Design an enzyme around this catalytic site. Structure first.
Site, mmCIF file in Angstrom:
data_model
loop_
_atom_site.group_PDB
_atom_site.id
_atom_site.type_symbol
_atom_site.label_atom_id
_atom_site.label_comp_id
_atom_site.label_asym_id
_atom_site.label_seq_id
_atom_site.Cartn_x
_atom_site.Cartn_y
_atom_site.Cartn_z
ATOM 1 N N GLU A 231 -5.053 3.798 -10.972
ATOM 2 C CA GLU A 231 -5.051 2.734 -10.523
ATOM 3 C C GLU A 231 -6.366 2.851 -11.634
ATOM 4 O OE1 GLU A 231 -6.375 1.333 -6.118
ATOM 5 O OE2 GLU A 231 -6.178 3.827 -6.053
ATOM 6 N N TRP B 174 -9.507 6.535 -0.462
ATOM 7 C CA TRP B 174 -9.103 7.314 -2.776
ATOM 8 C C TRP B 174 -8.340 6.687 -2.858
ATOM 9 C CZ3 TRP B 174 -8.278 9.821 2.346
ATOM 10 C CH2 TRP B 174 -7.088 10.449 2.762
ATOM 11 N N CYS C 248 0.718 -1.327 -0.373
ATOM 12 C CA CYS C 248 0.589 0.185 0.090
ATOM 13 C C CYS C 248 0.921 1.422 0.352
ATOM 14 C CB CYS C 248 -1.190 -0.291 1.203
ATOM 15 S SG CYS C 248 -1.657 1.336 1.458
ATOM 16 N N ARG D 42 -0.412 4.671 2.024
ATOM 17 C CA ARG D 42 0.265 4.491 4.285
ATOM 18 C C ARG D 42 0.500 5.721 5.163
ATOM 19 N NH1 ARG D 42 3.772 -0.494 4.778
ATOM 20 N NH2 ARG D 42 4.505 0.086 3.049
HETATM 21 C C1 HEM Z 1 -6.144 6.302 2.247
HETATM 22 C C2 HEM Z 1 -6.030 6.272 1.204
HETATM 23 C C3 HEM Z 1 -5.397 4.714 0.035
HETATM 24 C C4 HEM Z 1 -4.544 4.917 -0.879
HETATM 25 C C5 HEM Z 1 -4.002 6.317 -1.669
HETATM 26 C C6 HEM Z 1 -3.896 3.969 -1.223
HETATM 27 C C7 HEM Z 1 -3.350 3.319 -2.642
HETATM 28 C C8 HEM Z 1 -3.399 1.649 -2.464
HETATM 29 C C9 HEM Z 1 -2.976 1.701 -3.756
HETATM 30 C C10 HEM Z 1 -2.642 2.288 -5.275
HETATM 31 C C11 HEM Z 1 -3.360 -0.427 -3.718
HETATM 32 C C12 HEM Z 1 -2.294 -0.544 -5.276
HETATM 33 C C13 HEM Z 1 -3.665 -1.315 -4.782
HETATM 34 C C14 HEM Z 1 -4.313 -2.263 -6.703
HETATM 35 O O1 HEM Z 1 -3.163 -2.305 -7.798
HETATM 36 O O2 HEM Z 1 -4.785 -2.897 -6.691
HETATM 37 C C15 HEM Z 1 -2.950 0.341 -2.374
HETATM 38 C C16 HEM Z 1 -3.344 -1.712 -2.037
HETATM 39 C C17 HEM Z 1 -3.573 -1.910 -0.873
HETATM 40 N N1 HEM Z 1 -4.109 -0.919 0.709
HETATM 41 FE FE1 HEM Z 1 -4.242 0.905 0.361
HETATM 42 N N2 HEM Z 1 -4.733 2.117 -0.354
HETATM 43 C C18 HEM Z 1 -4.971 3.575 0.725
HETATM 44 C C19 HEM Z 1 -5.881 3.704 1.751
HETATM 45 C C20 HEM Z 1 -5.960 2.227 2.339
HETATM 46 C C21 HEM Z 1 -6.525 1.827 3.605
HETATM 47 C C22 HEM Z 1 -7.808 2.390 4.478
HETATM 48 C C23 HEM Z 1 -6.703 0.409 3.932
HETATM 49 C C24 HEM Z 1 -6.536 -0.358 5.154
HETATM 50 C C25 HEM Z 1 -7.180 -0.295 6.297
HETATM 51 C C26 HEM Z 1 -5.252 -0.063 2.497
HETATM 52 C C27 HEM Z 1 -4.996 -1.720 2.420
HETATM 53 C C28 HEM Z 1 -4.120 -1.754 1.533
HETATM 54 C C29 HEM Z 1 -3.881 -3.162 1.296
HETATM 55 C C30 HEM Z 1 -3.707 -3.959 2.326
HETATM 56 C C31 HEM Z 1 -3.630 -3.392 0.319
HETATM 57 C C32 HEM Z 1 -2.652 -4.209 -0.699
HETATM 58 C C33 HEM Z 1 -4.034 -4.923 -1.649
HETATM 59 C C34 HEM Z 1 -3.702 -6.242 -2.349
HETATM 60 O O3 HEM Z 1 -2.761 -6.773 -1.951
HETATM 61 O O4 HEM Z 1 -4.266 -6.387 -3.254
HETATM 62 N N3 HEM Z 1 -5.479 0.861 2.081
HETATM 63 N N4 HEM Z 1 -3.395 0.862 -2.296
HETATM 64 C C1 LIG Z 2 -6.771 -6.926 -5.256
HETATM 65 N N1 LIG Z 2 -6.395 -5.340 -5.569
HETATM 66 C C2 LIG Z 2 -6.454 -4.266 -5.086
HETATM 67 C C3 LIG Z 2 -7.523 -3.386 -4.696
HETATM 68 C C4 LIG Z 2 -8.071 -3.488 -5.640
HETATM 69 C C5 LIG Z 2 -8.714 -1.964 -6.300
HETATM 70 F F1 LIG Z 2 -9.790 -1.856 -6.867
HETATM 71 C C6 LIG Z 2 -8.530 -0.878 -5.196
HETATM 72 C C7 LIG Z 2 -7.760 -1.230 -4.052
HETATM 73 C C8 LIG Z 2 -7.402 0.320 -3.385
HETATM 74 C C9 LIG Z 2 -7.883 0.111 -1.781
HETATM 75 C C10 LIG Z 2 -7.570 1.162 -1.105
HETATM 76 C C11 LIG Z 2 -8.159 1.374 0.393
HETATM 77 C C12 LIG Z 2 -7.178 2.322 -1.391
HETATM 78 C C13 LIG Z 2 -7.030 2.563 -3.154
HETATM 79 N N2 LIG Z 2 -6.792 3.395 -3.765
HETATM 80 N N3 LIG Z 2 -6.637 1.881 -3.670
HETATM 81 C C14 LIG Z 2 -7.627 -1.905 -3.741
#
Ligand code: HEM
Ligand SMILES: CNCc1cc(F)cc(-c2cc(C)cc(N)n2)c1
Ligand code: HEM
Ligand SMILES: CNCc1cc(F)cc(-c2cc(C)cc(N)n2)c1
Ligand SMILES: C[C@H](O)[C@H](O)[C@H]1CNc2nc(N)[nH]c(=O)c2N1
Ligand SMILES: C[C@H](O)[C@H](O)[C@H]1CNc2nc(N)[nH]c(=O)c2N1
Ligand SMILES: [Zn+2]
Lengths: 414, 418
Positions: B293, B288, B116, B119
């Site tokens: 993405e 958000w 992520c 973070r």
């Molecule tokens: C607040 C703004 C946030 C942004 C901008 C952000 C951004 C991202 C992005 C770009 C990814 C890659 C997603 C993908 O390619 O499918 C990701 C993955 C992830 N995010 Fe964040 N995220 C945010 C918040 C959060 C929150 C609130 C949580 C958990 C409470 C979280 C947990 C995760 C996890 C576990 C992944 C890995 C997903 C996977 O392995 O498929 N994120 N995030």
């Molecule tokens: C298996 N892929 C995980 C996944 C798919 C997806 F479409 C979006 C996100 C994601 C989640 C959060 C909390 C923020 C953000 N910006 N993106 C993660």
């Protein structure tokens, strides 16, 4: 055991058995991955060399369908006599060519490996002096450049003996541009080469102090002090960079050289170490357009290009850097193609690498690959390698890093 | 100690936090699996109902960590908590987290998510405790409140809603959707696909469950909610809770006529939250978007909406050979339009330049205060313009810290219908 890798775009699954043959360390542990570390992790004894030589001779004779043959067994015995009597041994020409090709085949960070079996091998193990090295390198450049129809080649100088008589090319590539730090803090030319430019100037190079001065060769034979040579300018093929739509692009005064020729790596074949082994192919456009021209620590032309594009540079979310980067990479490819100098774009190159990888899995049982290096530095996910799972492991023969020579050389003069 | 270097700035950070990693990465000193999506099946407790000697050590570990986190190791409350958890497991084979422990664990699962890039926000997470829920109707209510809270009229807020933990494995709560809000995908008679091809199978399950498809290009899927192991049930999210952004371009007036939109809330709902050996199988979390993405992956993957060909056509590019970089050029404009559109409608979005710069700062903060920050280069580096972002030039160590979010099987591969 078997390991599977999947392509998440096509759902093709390939099965890797080759990893069981791997040798040294990746740098990772069972609980930590160091896949994004650039450089993780005196000379071999008689006892260390025996099993290394055997493994290589065994694999060479297996590749030519002569494993267990009379010639296989006598070659093993011959190699052993040399190690016993001389603490080292000499490769046959056939084994040197095979070793050099497979070091390329095993280079997990190289996207161009579909070409691995078409490599011209120049045996330079009879060389004794820097003047001789200069001659071998000039011929390498002339052959590889081939008037723009570029050809893959490597030149292999004498192997390491006691560690005190190393042959080294001190340049990082055969052809690079000088860099000059100015009193006011700015840099003229390539900032990456400021230190090496300093070393050349100290050794007596008279620099023209421009933006694209081809550096001289700094050549070390037999552990002696290195010596300067000017590559004859008619052998350095260069491409002036213009854009097919922006006629102002040529006013940037950008050019680049056509031949990418890495000269600071170490080639290891059967426990033998070839510390001077310059090799060359042809460029993928992003090496120049993205890294050379747009890295902040390099020529750093993004601001200038975006200005002439009238882009809004007030905010990042306008993506002005992204828009300028594409145009720069368009111009690089258009320029090389127009001058009929071999170049490959990242889409074509990554597509060929996927075909290569699948063939290698089928015919060899795997293909070690470094995703972090294979994915191009722009437009990552619209190339097929981005979606391809890969396994990274180290096979031998291999290309390896080594310390920069100025950090270890002990000078002899006065 | 292990060092990571940034090759742009020459900053070197020293990692000791990796000394607390618990699960295998999948790599060995002979093989690196850093680009494998699911490298390892190493789990902390066997599939379902653990024995006492299997669950208690994981619980003791987490309570120890939490009470250390608040400067109360060995305190009265710490040792009573250990004895309490000891008795709950003795009598029920599980235990229950205090509200403070649940909030701590959720925030640290996000803090530990090496994939992520967002973070730096990890401690600003609103946690909705839904462990009193008993039915799919109640799950729907909890999810509606989450979506409304997190959307907040475009000023998005990070949130997670946590349903009852797994007990015996037959009574799982699951959100069958992979995200709370996604578009349907339909197999066409001729052979192509309408809508989102990644959701063709889930759309078929919904249709086969009684969903009446509008059969359009952007049909918000229904929620398929499973409570206490029972058959899942369909619910339509009230459309006034589903914020959508129509996509237009600040220069190309024709761009609006492609008829693209996307939703504002990314809400992952198929992952598993693991705290002290407890497994929360339904834990939808939302934040958000980073613009890439939508504009790179959702719009431009070959097996997603695949719009590059269309956009390039309208841009009048030479699509005869790859070397014209017609794909790269269209790709930039699409991502410009996404940012401009979200920003025009005042819906929270971050570009990949700002997001990656924030993450570098987050990495520095974590090395300074915590001695490490686990990060997966393969996932952190954005899918376009990689090396003109600072994370491309940042070495990163990856390792698995607990609490954590994990993958889990799709429930239709495991559910025995009733
Ligand atoms: C607040 C703004 C946030 C942004 C901008 C952000 C951004 C991202 C992005 C770009 C990814 C890659 C997603 C993908 O390619 O499918 C990701 C993955 C992830 N995010 Fe964040 N995220 C945010 C918040 C959060 C929150 C609130 C949580 C958990 C409470 C979280 C947990 C995760 C996890 C576990 C992944 C890995 C997903 C996977 O392995 O498929 N994120 N995030
Ligand atoms: C298996 N892929 C995980 C996944 C798919 C997806 F479409 C979006 C996100 C994601 C989640 C959060 C909390 C923020 C953000 N910006 N993106 C993660
Ligand atoms: C024939 C066309 C070739 C193409 C298009 C090609 C492409 C590339 C590219 C784009 C890189 C990444 C370079 C960087 O980012 O610094 C690379 C790395 C590499 N290439 Fe190739 N290559 C070619 C030929 C060769 C040959 C002939 C050899 C050796 C015999 C070779 C060995 C390597 C090695 C060892 C690396 C790793 C460099 C490092 O670790 O710094 N390549 N190649
Ligand atoms: C630091 N990485 C080593 C490096 C630097 C460099 F400028 C170019 C290349 C390279 C080499 C070959 C044989 C082909 C090609 N296309 N590129 C490799
Ligand atoms: C930190 C990271 O390992 C480093 O910047 C790598 C990333 N991937 C790369 N990929 C290529 N082809 N060349 C490089 O120099 C790098 N640099
Ligand atoms: C094979 C490769 O690991 C896979 O395609 C990954 C690469 N990096 C990624 N990075 C992010 N953020 N999201 C992804 O889905 C992927 N996919
Ligand atoms: Zn690894």
């Amino acid at each position: 055991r078997f390991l599977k890798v999947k392509n998440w775009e096509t759902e093709v699954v390939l099965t890797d058995t080759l990893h069981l043959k791997s040798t040294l360390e990746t740098g990772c542990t069972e609980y930590i991955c160091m896949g994004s570390i650039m450089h993780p992790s005196d000379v071999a004894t008689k006892d260390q060399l025996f099993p290394l030589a055997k493994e290589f001779i065994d694999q060479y004779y297996s590749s030519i369908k002569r494993f267990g043959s009379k010639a296989h067994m006598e070659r093993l015995e011959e190699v052993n006599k040399e190690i016993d009597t001389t603490s080292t041994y000499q490769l046959k020409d056939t084994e040197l060519i095979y070793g050099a090709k497979h070091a390329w085949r095993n280079a997990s960070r190289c996207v161009g490996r579909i070409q691995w079996s078409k490599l011209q091998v120049f045996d330079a193990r009879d060389c004794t002096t820097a003047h001789g090295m200069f001659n071998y390198i000039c011929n390498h450049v002339k052959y590889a450049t081939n008037k723009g129809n570029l050809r893959s080649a490597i030149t292999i100088f004498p192997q390491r003996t006691d560690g005190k008589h190393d042959f080294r090319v001190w340049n990082s590539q055969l052809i690079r541009y000088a860099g000059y730090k100015q009193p006011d803090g700015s840099t003229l030319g390539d900032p990456a080469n400021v230190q090496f430019t300093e070393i050349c100037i100290q050794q007596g190079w008279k620099p023209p102090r421009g933006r694209f001065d081809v550096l001289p060769l700094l050549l070390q034979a037999n552990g002696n002090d290195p010596e300067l040579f000017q590559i004859p300018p008619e052998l350095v093929l260069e491409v002036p960079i213009r854009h097919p739509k922006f006629e102002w692009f040529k006013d940037l005064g950008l050019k680049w050289y056509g031949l990418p020729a890495v000269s600071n790596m170490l080639l290891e074949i059967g426990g033998l170490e070839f510390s001077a082994c310059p090799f060359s192919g042809w460029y993928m456009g992003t090496e120049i357009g993205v890294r050379d021209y747009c890295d902040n620590s390099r020529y750093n032309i993004l601001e200038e290009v975006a200005k002439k594009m009238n882009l809004d540079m007030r905010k990042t979310s306008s993506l002005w850097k992204d828009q300028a980067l594409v145009e720069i990479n368009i111009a690089v490819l258009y320029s090389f193609q127009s001058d009929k100098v071999t170049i490959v774009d990242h889409h074509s190159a990554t597509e060929s690498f996927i075909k290569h990888m699948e063939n290698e899995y089928r015919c060899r049982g795997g293909c070690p690959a470094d995703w972090v290096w294979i994915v191009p530095p722009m437009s990552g996910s619209i190339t097929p390698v981005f979606h391809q799972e890969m396994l990274n492991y180290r096979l031998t023969p291999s290309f390896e890093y080594q310390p920069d020579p100025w950090n270890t050389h002990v000078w002899k003069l006065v």
